[PDB]
Amino acid sequence: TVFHKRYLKKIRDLGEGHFGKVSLYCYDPTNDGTGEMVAVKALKADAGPQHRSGWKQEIDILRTLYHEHIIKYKGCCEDAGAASLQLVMEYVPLGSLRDYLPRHSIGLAQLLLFAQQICEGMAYLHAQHYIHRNLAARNVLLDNDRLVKIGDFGLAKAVPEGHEYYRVREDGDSPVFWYAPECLKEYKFYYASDVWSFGVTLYELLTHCDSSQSPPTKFLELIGIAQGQMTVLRLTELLERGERLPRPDKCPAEVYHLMKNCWETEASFRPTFENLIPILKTVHEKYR
Ligand SMILES: O=C(Nc1ccnc(NC(=O)[C@H]2C[C@H]2F)c1)c1c(Cl)cccc1Cl
DSSP: OEEOGGGEEEEEEEEEOSSEEEEEEEEOTTSSSOOEEEEEEEEOTTOOHHHHHHHHHHHHHHHTOOOTTBOOEEEEEEETTTTEEEEEEEOOTTEEHHHHTTTSOOOHHHHHHHHHHHHHHHHHHHHTTEEOSOOSGGGEEEEETTEEEEOOOSSOEEOOSSOSEEEOOOOTTOOGGGOOHHHHSSOEEEHHHHHHHHHHHHHHHHTTTOTTSSHHHHHHHHHOSOOTTOHHHHHHHHHHTTOOOOOOTTOOHHHHHHHHHHTOSSGGGSOOHHHHHHHHHHHHHHHO
């Protein structure tokens, strides 16, 4: 599907993704105003060949994905400036859980329904042989009080049929506070590594995305802020010692133990996303 830049009317910027900025546009070819609202992700004009090859890969990944709990790909727009493609996706009206939750006190049952929906979208992604590599409350978009969607595939990679992991590189933009120890130490990203990040995302939802309770805040309190180039090493060490993010207030102990199971140091001891679906359906049922 192809969108024309001449019909895209910019409303406002939505935020910064991984390779570039996301903006809210009205695609109005009739010029009346009845045009559909679209979220357009664009690659920065000054970006090198390293980001350009990754951006094209992000587009191809989202184009091949079709799930009710994954952001709907709408099409691409020919960006004459920057000589690249603009990723046109659906506008998810309520936005990110990182932005929504601190302003809207959402009940425990709805938060568990969101976690269940995340696992549903993630089991699909894993069945398609892809790893997300950036599962966080910031990347989970809210369509309505009962529907959630995974939104940023900038770090998403395809795991080859024979392999069970993807070898990652030393990057400053890596979401380390959402990463399993094997990612930090051995630079390997398994399907089980996305389950660690889910556990962290579940923690964020149960804290209502309170920035003072956030994973970078809580981990840096244990590490310290004057550790030179050793923040990640110190993070790897505390996780190896069995230290974890604390139990959020009003979080049921059962739910916290499920979180701790998503955070097993041993990747094989962790549940798959397919294992978490009937578990979270039952837990949501208990609290509804
Ligand atoms: O693409 C993003 N957000 C996005 C996409 C589609 N619709 C929305 N909706 C809204 O932002 C709602 C609040 C009103 F603007 C957000 C996005 C951004 Cl930018 C930054 C990081 C991660 C993601 Cl997923």
